[PDB]
Amino acid sequence: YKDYSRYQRPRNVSKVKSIKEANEWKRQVSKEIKQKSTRIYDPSLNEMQIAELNDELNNLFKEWKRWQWHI
Amino acid sequence: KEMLAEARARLLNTQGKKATRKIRERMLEESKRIAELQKRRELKQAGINVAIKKPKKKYGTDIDYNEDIVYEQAPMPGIYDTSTEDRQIKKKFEQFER
Amino acid sequence: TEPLLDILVKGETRIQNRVKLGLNSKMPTRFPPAVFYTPKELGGLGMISASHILIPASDLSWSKQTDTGITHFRAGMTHEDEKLIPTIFRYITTWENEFLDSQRVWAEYATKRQEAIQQNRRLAFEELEGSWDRGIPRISTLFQRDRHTLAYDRGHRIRREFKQYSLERNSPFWWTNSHHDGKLWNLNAYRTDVIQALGGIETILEHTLFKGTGFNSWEGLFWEKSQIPNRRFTLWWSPTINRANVYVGFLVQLDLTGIFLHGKIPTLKISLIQIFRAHLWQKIHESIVFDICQILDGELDVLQIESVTKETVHPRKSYKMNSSAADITMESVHEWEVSKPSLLHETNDSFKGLITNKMWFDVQLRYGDYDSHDISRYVRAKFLDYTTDNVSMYPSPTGVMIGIDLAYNMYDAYGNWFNGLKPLIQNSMRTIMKANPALYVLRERIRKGLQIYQSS
RNA sequence: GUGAUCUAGAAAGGUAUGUCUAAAGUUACUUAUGCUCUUAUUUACUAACAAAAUCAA
């Protein structure tokens, strides 16, 4: 149990533990990857907002690289 | 004039919370739809095909109207023999889908 | 008038029912008349009783045809205890008495004024003091400050009557102007007499949490605020509201503590969860057990012990009223003769009954109601029940049980004593009930929930 | 120089509500802040909390 839907990233990638555990933290990145990718193409017109959202994407996608790097 | 600019805007806004919120939810729903469609197009640019997800059922017997003729009230059987005419609609309707 | 007296009863009971509907209880036993009729200075509603009156119920047929007289009294307002509560018709002097008084007084004022005229002098203001609040215009109006500008005010009876067509609200004393007629009635005697009709202040404070705060006397308490709120009221009279003499009510034993609620009183449950929070009941019980065991091995040579031991208390034990076990256990250098089981303030015993090595100490904390706030009955009952109980694990049929009432800050021990315990343990419990910090957190927080501040 | 003894407590009554959760494929090697336990003071939000009435100066 213990969900993985509660906690944070956790910040350092190398400090995470056995491979069956970081697998679920990894998909705990990919959903927000999926969610905010759908939030890219929206015609909602806020160009300043989608710029900071674009930076958050690039941040999370770099994390997704790092979780794959640890594995 | 600022009182008059407030009065000019209040007299020309007639809806309330429920209609304005319904407008906002309708614009945001279409914005979600436009985003999801262009996703499938950009994935189709890569050659990888991803189907559109159906809307989730709210209740148990929710109807997929797209799936079938909804409540098919067929016309009453007449005498004038619509046999060639059904062949030409089907040929035209299959032509339209092609 | 007979039907007016019935409507006085019907009104006063319905307003007492209104306060009873403020809680979820229309119980008689939860609401003694000390709840309603004690003044606001002592924490009650300060209602005025007018219907604790025997009502003349004499013979309805032929009452329409003769005016029979008063031959039978019907009981007006009846409660379980028959406190005789005064009614303010006794405190208002009647009109014919006020008018016959006024004929004499204004005559006596007229004579004394003529004597001030003939002697050409200013009035004495103390010669007239014997008839100061007397007379129907109230002689005090003659010496008012703004009497020279009130004299131009004419037509004030009628203007006060027609306020009902101008004003949304009423002023129900539409027949008096206090500036023209003075004050016509005084009800200060009613406050003192209701206090001694309920037995006195000390009998009233038996109904309250006043002993729970730790205060010595009443004379140094004002009150924090002239309206007391509902949570402060239902926590002030709370040993009478949560009492064991209830007619029906389902026992629930709170959550973390040892207070039992007869049913649901949701305002009183909120206050007591705030009083007993962050596991205060365990923290109190641990603090007493820690204090006695330190005092016990303080005189380890005089009390002649080998060693004191805290038996490791299950944290659920401290509020488990069903059964208990030993907290502190005694090991003896040589073997101890324990007397018969006796009270903490019992005088002396014959020690020569039984010789026992190992003793125990147990602490029972209880929250007292208005029904059961005598611990000495309680502690001996818990002692006889548990020592006869085969469930309650004791090291030996020995030891005392130390009971503390938290709602009334009382303490008593019932059990057997070897020599030299009792003037020791009484001095310790004086010091423990006055110096325990956990019991100070208890006293102070109750003072915050009750909003009673010392004369400081 | 007597008596007739009503009651009785529980729910809904406190909050909305709604939406989302590719893991599992349907045949053409980039490394970057670890929120501490208690008490006091100040600020912001918050209780959609409460409140001077008759009357006495």
UniProtKB/Swiss-Prot annotation, chain A:
It comes from the Eukaryota. It is found in: Cytoplasm; Nucleus. Coiled coil: none annotated. Present with 1990 molecules/cell in log phase SD medium. Belongs to the ISY1 family. Involved in pre-mRNA splicing and cell cycle control. As a component of the NTC complex (or PRP19-associated complex), associates to the spliceosome to mediate conformational rearrangement or to stabilize the structure of the spliceosome after U4 snRNA dissociation, which leads to spliceosome maturation. The cell cycle arrest of SYF2 defective cells may be due to the inefficient splicing of TUB1. Also involved in DNA repair. Belongs to the NTC complex (or PRP19-associated complex), composed of at least CEF1, CLF1, ISY1, NTC20, SNT309, SYF1, SYF2, and PRP19. This is Pre-mRNA-splicing factor ISY1. It comes from Saccharomyces cerevisiae (strain ATCC 204508 / S288c) (Baker's yeast). The gene is ISY1.
Swiss-Prot record, chain B:
Transmembrane segments: none annotated. It is found in: Cytoplasm; Nucleus. Disulfide bonds: none annotated. Involved in pre-mRNA splicing and cell cycle control. Required for the binding of the NTC complex (or PRP19-associated complex) components to the spliceosome to mediate conformational rearrangement or to stabilize the structure of the spliceosome after U4 snRNA dissociation, which leads to spliceosome maturation. Its absence leads to an arrest of the cell cycle, possibly due to the inefficient splicing of TUB1. Present with 784 molecules/cell in log phase SD medium. Belongs to the CEF1 family. Belongs to the NTC complex (or PRP19-associated complex), composed of at least CEF1, CLF1, ISY1, NTC20, SNT309, SYF1, SYF2, and PRP19. This is Pre-mRNA-splicing factor CEF1. It comes from Saccharomyces cerevisiae (strain ATCC 204508 / S288c) (Baker's yeast). The chain holds residues 149 to 246 of 590 of the full protein.
Swiss-Prot record, chain C:
Residues 280-451 are annotated as: Restriction endonuclease homology domain. It is found in: Nucleus. Residues 24-276 are annotated as: Linker. Changing residue 327 to N: No effect on viability. It comes from the Eukaryota. Component of the U4/U6-U5 tri-snRNP complex composed of the U4, U6 and U5 snRNAs and at least PRP3, PRP4, PRP6, PRP8, PRP18, PRP31, PRP38, SNU13, SNU23, SNU66, SNU114, SPP381, SMB1, SMD1, SMD2, SMD3, SMX2, SMX3, LSM2, LSM3, LSM4, LSM5, LSM6, LSM7, LSM8, BRR2 and DIB1. The MPN (JAB/Mov34) domain has structural similarity with deubiquitinating enzymes, but lacks the residues that would bind the catalytic metal ion. Contains a region with structural similarity to reverse transcriptase, presenting the classical thumb, fingers and palm architecture, but lacks enzyme activity, since the essential metal-binding residues are not conserved. Present with 468 molecules/cell in log phase SD medium. Functions as a scaffold that mediates the ordered assembly of spliceosomal proteins and snRNAs. Required for association of BRR2 with the spliceosomal U5 snRNP, and the subsequent assembly of the U4/U6-U5 tri-snRNP complex. Functions as a scaffold that positions spliceosomal U2, U5 and U6 snRNAs at splice sites on pre-mRNA substrates, so that splicing can occur. Interacts with both the 5' and the 3' splice site, as well as the branch region. Has a role in branch site-3' splice site selection. Associates with the branch site-3' splice 3'-exon region. Also has a role in cell cycle. This is Pre-mRNA-splicing factor 8. It comes from Saccharomyces cerevisiae (strain ATCC 204508 / S288c) (Baker's yeast). The chain holds residues 1353 to 1829 of 2413 of the full protein.
